[PDB]
Every structure is written in structure tokens, then in C-alpha cells.
Amino acid sequence: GASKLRAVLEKLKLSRDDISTAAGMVKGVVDHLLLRLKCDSAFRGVGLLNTGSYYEHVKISAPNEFDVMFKLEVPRIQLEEYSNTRAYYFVKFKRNPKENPLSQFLEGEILSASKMLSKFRKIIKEEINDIKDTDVIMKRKRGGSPAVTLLISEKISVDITLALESKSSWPASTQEGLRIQNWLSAKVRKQLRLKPFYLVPKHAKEGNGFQEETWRLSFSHIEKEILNNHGKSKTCCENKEEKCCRKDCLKLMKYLLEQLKERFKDKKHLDKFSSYHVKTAFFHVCTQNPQDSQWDRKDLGLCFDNCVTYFLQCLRTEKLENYFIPEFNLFSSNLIDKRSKEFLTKQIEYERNNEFPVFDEF
Numbered sequence: 001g002a003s004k005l006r007a008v009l010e011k012l013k014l015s016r017d018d019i020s021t022a023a024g025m026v027k028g029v030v031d032h033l034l035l036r037l038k039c040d041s042a043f044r045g046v047g048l049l050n051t052g053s054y055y056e057h058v059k060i061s062a063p064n065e066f067d068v069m070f071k072l073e074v075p076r077i078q079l080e081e082y083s084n085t086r087a088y089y090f091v092k093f094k095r096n097p098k099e100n101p102l103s104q105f106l107e108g109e110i111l112s113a114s115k116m117l118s119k120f121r122k123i124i125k126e127e128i129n130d131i132k133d134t135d136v137i138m139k140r141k142r143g144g145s146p147a148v149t150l151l152i153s154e155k156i157s158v159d160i161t162l163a164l165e166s167k168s169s170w171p172a173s174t175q176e177g178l179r180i181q182n183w184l185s186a187k188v189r190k191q192l193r194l195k196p197f198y199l200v201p202k203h204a205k206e207g208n209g210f211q212e213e214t215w216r217l218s219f220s221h222i223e224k225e226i227l228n229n230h231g232k233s234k235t236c237c238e239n240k241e242e243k244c245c246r247k248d249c250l251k252l253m254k255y256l257l258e259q260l261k262e263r264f265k266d267k268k269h270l271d272k273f274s275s276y277h278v279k280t281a282f283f284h285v286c287t288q289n290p291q292d293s294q295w296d297r298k299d300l301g302l303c304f305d306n307c308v309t310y311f312l313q314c315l316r317t318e319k320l321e322n323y324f325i326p327e328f329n330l331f332s333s334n335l336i337d338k339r340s341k342e343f344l345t346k347q348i349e350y351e352r353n354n355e356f357p358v359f360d361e362f
């Protein structure tokens with residue numbers, strides 16, 4: 001019916017106009033840090049990957065939560081796959097034309113993420129002390145995950161991820177991924193694979209067996225491009241007659257998971273599940289439902305139910321392929337325990353049967 005769902009979207013947007021003030025505060029700090037990082041020998045070519053102000057909001061429940069990614073271009077990269085995981089690689093250099101300033105970040109022959117991150121945190125920490133025009137402090141240490149957490153005016157938090165940039169062709173593991181031919185045409189897919197790919201140092205809970213010095217592929221820039229150009233029609237959501245509910249279904253699905261995680265934060269068995277699992281499942285639904293008529297504004301309740309049931313199927317069958325790397329199973333028994341998915345399945349099933357009481361009125 002979406003009468004309830006519409007009411008949900010209306011309160012989430014009222015908080016995003018309040019964000020614009022804090023968004024400018026993020027940009028000011030980010031621009032300042034980039035200025036210093038460029039003055040460093042190793043971080044000479046750093047910069048923002050995508051739109052700096054108002055970057056990713058992993059939490060939509062928390063407007064104060066901010067996510068930022070820094071790109072560092074390194075040419076002539078030799079990627080060695082780690083144990084056929086297909087999502088994690090070792091970074092090596094080729095031929096050594098001459099020693100690079102990045103040689104201070106490598107152990108043995110592989111490029112160490114720990115060394116690069118350590119100096120990265122030190123340079124940032126040095127700067128926020130020299131900033132008294134804007135009250136900022138650094139959080140420590142969040143388990144060791146690459147994200148550096150800063151806090152502006154004691155209310156908003158900003159996570160800064162350092163990523164490597166490669167303008168070479170996408171790895172072989174992404175060959176059969178990004179299947180958007182029926183949805184966004186083979187031309188667009190081909191254009192997207194011409195874009196550079198990115199490497200991100202491993203998570204806090206990696207989890208083993210990981211050598212601790214491997215890097216994970218990142219295509220968040222492609223995901224954003226798809227989100228802003230989601231329609232089968234080139235004018236989708238550019239006029240009143242083509243206002244689909246794709247983005248809304250993604251928000252509701254992300255907000256559902258967050259509300260569930262907040263509800264069971266004492267057990268910490270929904271913490272493995274992140275907004276990226278939801279985001280991954282959503283892209284698959286878009287692939288299975290490429291027509292814009294399958295995402296009509298009037299069928300918001302019906303469209304959201306499809307996203308829910310598909311996510312349920314992914315839990316039961318324990319299959320959730322990475323949208324770019326097919327052989328990478330996000331819901332594999334090695335990444336998340338089976339009891340966790342069954343727990344999440346039961347909770348979601350309860351929400352579907354009782355018209356999602358966790359959403360509203362609140």
C-alpha cells in the first residue's frame with residue numbers, strides 16, 4: 001500500500017536538508033587534510049574520488065554519520081590474487097624502473113597496507129591539533145579497519161577511507177560480473193569497465209585466513225553512477241511521469257536493516273550484515289526487473305516487498321554474489337554464520353507479516 005512507507009520516506013528527507021550545514025563542515029576539514037597530504041612525499045597524488053561534500057551515507061538513520069574515500073593513484077601495479085578468494089589481492093610493483101616514494105610502505109615485495117595506513121593516520125592526527133578554528137577530534141581506533149574516524153563539533157562523525165587507484169583493465173574476476181546488459185545496455189557496461197578500479201585495505205574482522213596485507217576491490221564509484229542513472233529510460237526521474245521508486249526501495253531496505261541492528265545491538269549478530277549486503281541484493285533485483293514499469297511510483301509497496309522476499313531467498317539459499325565479482329559469495333558460511341542468516345530471516349519474516357512495525361510511526 002505504501003501509505004506507511006511513504007510516511008517513512010517523508011521523515012528521512014526532512015533530516016537530509018539539515019545535513020547540508022554539516023556537509024559543508026565535512027568538506028572544509030576534508031579539503032584541509034588533502035592540502036597537507038599532498039605536501040607529503042608518499043601521498044603526492046591523493047585526492048577525492050567522487051563528490052566530496054555529501055559523500056556516502058552508510059547510515060541513513062544517522063545524518064551525522066559521514067563516509068569519505070580518498071584515492072591515491074599508483075601506476076604499474078602487479079596484482080597477485082590471494083588464495084582464489086577473487087575479492088582480495090596482493091599489491092606488487094613491476095620491474096622497478098626506479099625506486100618510488102611508495103617504497104617506504106612495502107614489506108619484502110608486497111605493498112603493506114599497515115605501513116601506509118599508519119603514516120596516513122599520523123599525518124591526519126598532526127593536522128587536527130593545528131586546527132582550532134573548528135573543533136575536531138579523532139576517534140581511536142575502531143578495531144583497525146582502514147577508516148579514520150573524525151568528529152566535528154562533537155556531533156557528526158566522518159570516516160575517511162584510503163584507497164589505491166588503478167586505471168588498468170578490471171581484474172579477471174570481474175569478467176562475468178556487472179550484468180546490466182538487459183537493464184542499462186551493453187554499451188553502458190562497456191563504458192563503466194573503462195573507468196578505473198580501486199583497492200581498499202582489509203576490514204577489522206577480516207576475517208582469517210587472511211595474510212593481513214591484502215587489498216579488496218572497490219567499485220563504489222560505479223555503484224553511485226548506476227544509482228544516479230538507474231532507469232531503463234534516459235529520462236527516468238527527470239520528469240513527473242518517470243518518477244520510479246528504485247532509490248526509495250533501496251532506502252527502505254537499508255533503513256530496515258539499521259533499525260534491526262539497533263534493536264539487536266546487544267547480541268551483535270546483525271553486525272556482520274551491512275548496508276552493502278542490502279545494496280548488493282538491490283542491484284540484483286534491478287537486473288531481474290530492468291523495466292521502469294516494474295518500479296512505478298504507485299507500486300512502492302509491491303516493489304519493496306519484492307526486494308524483501310529476494311533478500312530472504314538470499315538468506316535461505318545462503319547465496320549473495322558480489323555484483324561485480326560473481327564467484328565472491330557474501331553470504332558464504334565462511335563469512336557469516338548460518339545461525340545469523342536464519343536469525344535475520346526470522347526477524348525479517350516477522351516484519352513482512354506484521355507490516356513492518358519497526359519502521360513507523362516511531
Ligand SMILES: [Zn+2]
Pocket residue numbers: 230231236237242243244245246
Ligand atoms: Zn528512476
